[PDB]
Symmetry: C2
């Protein structure tokens, strides 16, 4: 269960750019306190960790955390059980886990001055946003309200502190620069599979349209849908009749068509309502967001694709949250991912 | 050289507190955009990773990154060679690596509003500080000026971008709360050895005085010296006759004397001048900082301690930077750490 044999492991930085302050650096002058004068800063680089089994079988997997998270979520569950990193090294895949730019060991671009500001340039906004425990509780469908759990819960109850401690803010790095870093990683790795989550769902779809080395996508509970430009289908408002889901991302149809060349699976957990739910905003948000994703997958399929929606309850798994890969049944979730990889030969050399 | 057999691996969050916003949370109202209303935020928690070998021998090692760094620096060198994590799991030690609060996967305490501000409470400062590539080049003694290498340098040339990309800012989390998180980890772990670096040198000394489970300290190029309260010796200014080293940390003698109860080694690399060097501020800074540490160790030994200063050149290792554990000879550096552990029985069950 817990044992793991690695041919090699390591980590590295990839992607990013540099920005500079004014003037010249004088090594005779006091270097502390730190100044922007004569300064070169590396910004928006990404952290990558890799673990390779002895004699891997099939393509490397790239696990890409959701919004406000880090590669921790693939390492261990909140109660300390093995994460997908261990499970899939054991399943003989090389496993990459990333901390995207702006998260965890990824770069947070700030300097000497107000957060995110390099002299007169605003690299990222000084004003931040961040979810609360309460917001995240309902966003991840632990239960309909903070403190409550759905009946069928696979959440590791008792480990709420561990769970919410893994979450944090993201600075306003452009999504283009996040996608760019992962495109560079995919170039470095070669043919691979992207395994995405929540906020990284739409970013992974974008990466695949720029990087033919992406041979497959599995997206756990993706947060933003994607459509060809000008072809977003009618999507209803939420039951409060005022709110909307996240504005779907629109890409040129020439790029969207690249999504029809690779197997794509979206995975949803449990307790997404079938009918409008005006008393529970994020439950209703998930209902309409999942609907929008079903239309996105249909558009990919109308273009020759191999896109599918897996609702874990239809596969016999009840009670999953929006983090199925750290829930109590995450070994059974992993088995369904192994099934997808096997079906498309992504577990074969 | 690279194969590793883990009995188990994983990661978890530990330490920290909570802060709360005003008001209450209504699950029926839009959760996004995120708001401080009814919000609970987990802040200042620390990320911990562990890798355990089969049949461990001796005490677990806790590797604690220097200032503006993360546990990455123990995983791999900038040119991709094994870091101390791999080397010491191979040396049959369980190995913990942390991202301290405010760094990497540790929490960065910010909310909805100007960086670090929770309504009118400033949790961390909105104005940040951060080294440049140029300041870090001379701080780490790659050479005397940015872009120039000492002839004898053990730095992995050609991987400068990779190296500097690992560095970043730290918010103004109080050092007390950083020490608190590690004390809690040490309580959770049991008897262990701290391996510290640069800015975590003084913090690790402080942890030892609060945590009898710390059975030894090895500090690579510690940045701040520590003395009993009111017994700071005379320390000269820098060669410019205007700058000072970091103000020594002072602790109550009853706490200081706990440092005499365990083996302590400070490790310094090469190219620290013996004589005043007015032209190169950080070289001179290291000359006086090393001298202050020599007096700190002497004060520990006058309390019955066993505190030593290891200059790597005297061991036949030339050219090390302020990150000896990621330099080209880091295997030989690791051998000297294994020697220390073995001399003191810390590699024995
Ligand atoms: C502050 C403006 O909010 C905002 N607007 C847009 N559309 C313009 N997109 C984003 N990005 C996200 O995906 N949000 S989220 O918080 O990471 C998220 C939401 C829902 C479900 C899951 C997540 C997630 O990844 O949690 C694991 N955020
Ligand atoms: C505004 C600064 O005044 C101030 N005083 C104190 N005294 C406790 N400590 C700090 N912290 C730092 O600046 N650490 S440092 O930059 O990362 C660093 C400096 C020198 C040598 C090494 C490091 C380091 O850790 O290299 C990885 N700063």
């Amino acid at each position: 269960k817990r044992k793991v044999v690695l041919a090699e492991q390591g980590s590295f930085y990839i992607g990013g750019r540099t920005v500079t302050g004014p003037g010249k650096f004088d090594p005779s002058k006091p270097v502390i306190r730190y100044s922007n004068e004569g300064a070169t800063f590396y910004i928006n680089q990404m952290y990558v960790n890799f673990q390779a089994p002895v004699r891997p079988r099939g393509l490397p997997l790239v696990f890409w955390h959701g919004g406000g998270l880090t590669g921790h979520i693939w390492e261990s569950t909140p109660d300390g059980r093995p994460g997908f990193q261990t499970l899939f090294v054991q399943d003989r895949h090389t496993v990459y886990t990333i901390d995207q730019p702006g998260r965890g060991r990824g770069n947070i671009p700030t300097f000497n001055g107000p957060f995110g500001q390099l002299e007169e340039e605003s690299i990222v906004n000084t004003v931040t946003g961040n979810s609360s425990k309460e917001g995240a509780w309902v966003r991840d469908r632990l239960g309909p309200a903070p403190g409550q759990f759905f009946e069928n819960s696979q959440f590791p109850r008792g480990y709420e502190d561990n769970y919410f401690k893994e979450m944090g803010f993201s600075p306003s790095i452009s999504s283009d620069e996040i996608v760019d870093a992962v495109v560079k990683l995919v170039t470095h790795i070669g043919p691979c599979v992207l395994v995405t989550h929540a906020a990284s769902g739409v970013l992974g779809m974008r990466v695949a349209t720029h990087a033919k080395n992406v041979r497959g996508i599995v997206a756990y509970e993706p947060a933003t849908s994607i459509f060809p430009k000008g072809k977003v289908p009618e999507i209803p408002p939420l039951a409060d009749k005022k709110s909307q889901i996240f504005p779907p991302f629109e890409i040129q149809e020439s790029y969207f068509k690249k999504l029809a060349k690779i197997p794509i699976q979206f995975v949803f957990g449990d307790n997404i309502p079938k009918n409008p739910k005006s008393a529970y905003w994020f439950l209703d948000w998930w209902r309409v967001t999942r609907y929008a994703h079903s239309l996105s997958l249909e558009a990919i399929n109308k273009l020759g694709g191999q896109a599918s929606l897996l609702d874990l309850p239809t596969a016999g798994l009840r009670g999953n949250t929006a983090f199925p890969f750290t829930d109590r049944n995450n070994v059974q979730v992993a088995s369904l991912l192994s099934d997808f990889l096997g079906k498309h030969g992504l577990d074969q050399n």
